[PDB]
C-alpha cells in the first residue's frame, strides 16, 4: 500500500515545564508515556488568535471535549484540583463534539486527508524509565472528524513531570503482514536497506 | 450443435456451445440506523419563531432531517423547492444545510423568487439566482394571532440600499431620505423603519401570515452534515440476489459466516482483492458473500448417423437448481424434458441430464472428465470407465514361458511434416487502395516489415523441414525390373 | 417535457354535471402538482382545484367548495375533474396545469406551469 | 454481464471463437499429454501377495492398501511436498479426465510389469521371469557375466535396499528438488493473478467501474 | 475513426500471425521428429522400444 | 493523441517480446537436440545411424 | 521521462510486469540452456604433459 507513514529508525523529538509550539508538516506521530495523567490535550489551528479558526481538544475527569471556534490562545497555556487559564474567547464557534476517553504508553497519529481529520489510538503497557520500548503494535483508527480547516502548527498542553515523543510522517512504501484474524503482526519499510527491498 | 459446428452431420464427441447464468431476484437494499433526530420540531411546532431582524443563521449539524413527514403534515400553503425536486429531496443531499425562520406576511410570499425584487425581497429577505434548496410556507392562523393583532414580529420596510442575497439585516438606526438631520425626537423625515405587522383574527387567508422556513443548500469546501433519511428493505439469505448496503453493492448469495470479524469492520476482502464477507449495519452480523453460480453447457452425442438422442451436462453446478438455472419456462417444451425428468445424475464434473448411471465398467468412448464416460447401447448410459483387462499371471521363481509361434503384423504411424505456404500483403489488405490510408500506414512505421519477414519465415522454415524429412539419399535408387 | 391534452368540455343546463379530464404525456414522474384554472369573460384567470400526486391532498377554492372535486387516475396518466351542482357563474374557459416544482396554494399565474389547450365549459 | 458492451462486441467480429478455440486447445493438449505418457499399457497387471523377490526390497514403492488412497508412500510424500484456483470473472478450472487414483493405478501397473514380467509386456505378452534372473539378464546387456551377481546376490540386494531408502531421505531434507513442478504452478498462478489485477485499470477512462461511466456520462459519449 | 478501424485490423492481423507462428513451432518440432523417424526407422535398425 | 502514441509503441513492444519468446522456444528445442546429441555421441558410442 | 505519459501508462496498468518477467525468463532460461549444454562433467580433466 502506497500511503504516508513513519519511516523506520527515523529521529523523533523528546521533551519533558516544556510545551513549545511545533509545526505540523502533513502528519504528526505523537507518543506519550505517563505514570500520572499530566497531558490533557492540544490546541490546533493556523495562527492561534482572533483571525483564523482554531480547534481545541481538552480531556478532563470523565469526558472529553472537541471544539473548533475563533479562539484566543494564550502565551502560556496550562491547566489544587482545578486550574483553567488556556483561553478567554467564545466567539464564532462552528462545531462541538463530546466523547468518552511510567505504566501507560499512548501512541497517536493525526492527519488531514480531503478535509477529514482521522485519529489513531492504541494503549499499551510499558515499564522502563528511559525511552520507548521495542516491539510492534498495530495502530487503530477511532474517530474521523469532518472539520476541513487548514493547519500548519500545533501545541500540546500539560497540567510531577511527564515525557512525550513527537514525530513526523513521510509518504513512503510499506509491506504489511496479515494474520488469520486480520490484524497486523509485522511490517517492513520499502526504503530501509536492500534486504527490505 | 448443428448451428454452432456449421454442419448438419455432427460426429461423435463432446462439444461446448453456450453458458448459463443464475439471476438476481429481489434486489435487496439496506441502510444503517438513521435515527439521529435533528431539532426541527422546535422550528416546526413553536408559538414564537424568529424575527426578520433576528432570523438566526443556525448551524444544525451531525444529525438527519426527515422531509417525508413534511409532505404529510397537511398544513402547507406554498411549499417551494428551487433547483432540486421535493420528490427526490430525501434520498440525495448536499452540504451547507444552513436554516432560517420567520413568520412572513402571506400577501407577497410569491415575490420571493430568483430574479424578482419587491418590498419583501428588497427590505426583508432576498433569494439568490439559481437557488438550490427549499423555502417552505404554511398556514399558521391558529397560533400567531392574539386579541387586537399579534404585534410580536416587527419588520423593516425602510433601508438605504437593495438587499444582497442572504444578508443579515439588523439595525436600530433610522432610514435617511432627506437632507435635514434628525434630532433624536422623531420628525418629518426621520422614517422609523420598525413598524408592525398587524396580524388580527379578522384578516383573510391571504392577509394572515405564511410561516416560512428556508432550507438553504450552498456549496463550500466542507463535508455535509445533515441529509434526508434513507429507506431500507430487509435482506434475503441463501439466494442469488442484488444487494446495496451502506455504500457497497453487488450481486451474489448471502450465507451465514464462520470467521470472526473484529468489532470495527463492516466487510471483508481476500487474496487478489475481491469482497467475500459483509457485516450489516443494522444487526452487526457478519454475512458471507458467495457469487452467483455459472457454467458452460456440454452436450453429448454419439453421432448424427447413429442416434437422435442427446445428453446434456451442466458443469460444476449443484444438480437441484438446474431447471431454474436455465429459463425452462421461457424455452420450448422440448427443452423442458432436458431440465427435469427421471434420468438425472450429478457427477464430479457437474450435473448430467439425459443419461442414467451404470454400475458396470466399460471402455471410455466420449471424454467428459473425472473418470465418467458415456456411450449408446439402444438409451444413453453413464459409467465410470474401465482401464482394461486385469492380469495376475502366476509369478514363479523357476518357471519361464517361452513363445514357440510367431505373428507378423504392422502398425501405421502418421506424422504431419509440412504446411501449405500462405503469405499476405499488408497494405491493401489494411486499406483497400486509399491514398490517405497508405499515407497513414507508412506513418505507422514498419509493421509491414516484421509482418512480411515473419510470414516469409514460416514458408522458408517449412521448406527446410520438408528438405530434412525427405532427402537423406545421395542418388536416385531403383529396384530390379 | 410535459404535454397536456384535455377534453371533457361541452354544454349542459343548470343542475347538471360534467366531467373534465386532462391527459398527461411525457415526464409523468416529475409531475407533483395538478391545478385547475378558470378564466371568466371579463375576469382574471384564478384557481379552482388542486391535487398532489405524491400525497393525494386536495386544495379547493372557496366558491367551488362542496360542489367541485378532483381525482387522480395514474393508470391512464389522466387527472379527473368532476363538476356537480353547476350554476351559471361557472361559464368560463377551464385550464389544466402541471407542476414539477412542488405544491402551492392559492394558484398563481406567474408560476411555471405546463399548460393545456383549453376546453370551453358553458352552462345557462 | 453488460448488454451494451456485448452489443458493441458484435462489431468486433469473431475474436471470441478464436479465443475459445485457443483455450479448449490447451485442455485437449493436457489430456493428450497425460494419455500419451501414462496410458501406454494394454492390460492392468497386479503384484503378487507373497513377495518373494530373492531378498530384494521394493516395500517403499509398491502401492499401500493400508492407505485409503491405495498409494505408495514415497509419492504420498511427493504429494505432501507440493502445496499451492478461485471462481470469479468468468474464470473456471475444468477437471482432468484422468483422476489421480487412476494415475496411481497406472504407475502400479507399470511397476508390476517392470518387476514381474521384465520388458516382455512392452512388446508383447507378460512373460514370467524372476528378478535375480532379470538382473542377470540386464547385466549381460552392459558386459557383465551372470556369475558375479549370483555369487553376490545378498550384497546387491542390501546395497539396493539401502540406496532406495536414501531416496526418501534425500527428498525429505531438500526443499528445492521439486522446483520443476512448482515453477509451472507459480507461473500460471501469477499469470491468473495478473489477469485478475488488470481488471482495475482505467485504460484511458474516468473510472474502472462501468457503472460510474454509465451514470456520470451521456451514453453516446460513454462509448469512447 | 479511421485510426480506430485501422488499429482494429492490425490487432486482428497480429493475433492471426501469432496463431500461425505458434503452430509453426509445433509443426517444425513434429517434422524434425518425423525426420528422426525416417532416419531411425528407415535407414537402419532401431533397438529402442516403440 | 498521446494515447494513440501509447497504443502504437506498446503494440510494437508486444509483438517484439512475442517474436523474442517464440525464437527462444526454437533455440530451446534446438538446445535439447544439441544436449541429447552431445551426451550420446561424445560420452559414449551410439548405434543410431545419421 | 514524461509524467503525464506515465499517468497514462499506469492507467494502462501493468503490461510492463509480464513483459519484464517474459524478458527475464529468456535470460534465466538461456543460463539454464548453456548450463545444460556445456556443464556436465563433474570434474575437470587435463592433458598429460
Ligand atoms: C438498528 O435498528 C434496529 C431496529 O430498531 C435494532 O434492532 C433491534 O435490536 C434490539 C436489540 O438487539 C432487539 O431487541 C431484542 O429483541 C428480541 C426479540 O424481541 C429479544 O428476545 C431480545 O432480548 C432483545 O430485546 C430488537 O428486536 C431489534 N429490532 C428489530 C426490528 O430487529 C438495532 O439494534 C439497531 N442497531 C443498533 C446498533 O442499535
Ligand atoms: C505359427 O502361426 C501360424 C499362423 O498364426 C500357424 O499357421 C497356421 O496353422 C494352422 C494349422 O495347420 C493352419 O490351419 C489349417 O490350414 C489348412 C490349409 O493348409 C486347412 O486345410 C485347415 O482346415 C486349417 O485351417 C493355418 O492355415 C495356418 N495359418 C496360415 C496363415 O497358413 C502355425 O501353425 C504356427 N506354428 C505352430 C508351430 O503352431
Ligand atoms: C523391505 O524394507 C522395509 C523398510 O526397510 C522393511 O520394513 C521394515 O520392517 C521391520 C520389521 O517388520 C520394521 O521394524 C520396520 O519398521 C520396517 N520399516 C519401514 C520403513 O516400514 C521390510 O521388512 C523389508 N522387506 C522384507 C521382506 O524384509
Ligand atoms: C538522529 O540524530 C542524531 C543526532 O541528532 C544523528 O547522529 C543520527 O544520525 C540521526 N539518525 C538518523 C537515522 O539520521
Ligand atoms: C465568523 O466566521 C465566519 C467564517 O469565516 C465569517 O464569515 C464571519 O464573518 C465571522 N463573523 C464574525 C462576527 O466574526
Ligand atoms: C488553507 O491554506 C491553504 C494553503 O495555506 C489554502 O490553499 C486554502 O485555501 C486555505 N483554506 C481556506 C479555507 O482559506
Ligand atoms: C484468532 O481468533 C481465535 C478465536 O478463538 C483464536 O483462537 C486465535 O488464537 C486467534 N489467532 C490470532 C493469531 O490471534
Ligand atoms: C407538530 O405537532 C403536531 C401535533 O402536536 C404533530 O401532528 C406534527 O407532526 C408535529 N410536527 C412535526 C414536524 O413533527
Ligand atoms: C456412423 O459413422 C461412424 C464413423 O464416423 C461409424 O463407425 C458408424 O458405423 C456409422 N453409422 C452408420 C449407421 O452408418
Ligand atoms: C446440492 O444442494 C443440496 C440442497 O439441499 C445439498 O443438500 C447438497 O449437499 C448439495 N450438493 C453439493 C455437492 O454441494
Ligand atoms: C447399482 O449401485 C447402487 C448403489 O448402491 C445400488 O443401489 C444398485 O442396486 C446397483 N444396481 C443397479 C442395477 O442399479
Author numbering:
A (entry chain B): 51 to 66, 79 to 141, 153 to 174, 186 to 243, 261 to 298
B (entry chain E): 299 to 676, 691 to 793
C (entry chain D): 1 to 124
D (entry chain B): 745 to 828, 852 to 991
E (entry chain E), F (entry chain C): 992 to 1041
G (entry chain C): 745 to 793
Sentences from the paper on this structure:
The spike glycoprotein is the most prominent surface‐exposed entity of severe acute respiratory syndrome coronavirus 2 (SARS‐CoV‐2) and possesses the vital molecular machinery required for recognition and fusion with host membranes. The spike protein mutations that cause increased virulence and immune evasion are predominantly found in the receptor‐binding domain (RBD), which is specifically responsible for host recognition via interaction with human angiotensin‐converting enzyme 2 (ACE2). Here, we present two synthetic single‐domain antibodies (sybodies), designated Sb#15 and Sb#68, that recognize non‐overlapping epitopes on the RBD. Cryogenic electron microscopy (cryo‐EM) revealed that Sb#15 binds within the ACE2 interface, whereas Sb#68 engages the adjacent conserved cryptic epitope.
Finally, analysis of the spike/Sb#68 complex dataset revealed two distinct populations. The second structure featured two RBDs in an up conformation with bound Sb#68. Density for the third RBD was very weak, presumably due to high intrinsic flexibility, hindering the interpretation of its exact position and conformation. We therefore refer to this conformation as an 2up/1flexible state. Cryo‐EM map of S‐6P, with two Sb#68 bound to up‐RBDs of the spike featuring a 2up/1flexible conformation. Although the binding epitope of Sb#68 is clearly distinct from the one of ACE2, there would be a steric clash between the Sb#68 backside loops and ACE2, if ACE2 docks to the RBD. This accounts for Sb#68’s ability to compete with ACE2 as evident from GCI analyses. Upon addition of Sb#15, the conformational equilibrium was shifted toward an asymmetric 1up/1up‐out/1down state, whereas addition of Sb#68 favored an asymmetric state with RBDs adopting a 2up/1flexible conformation.
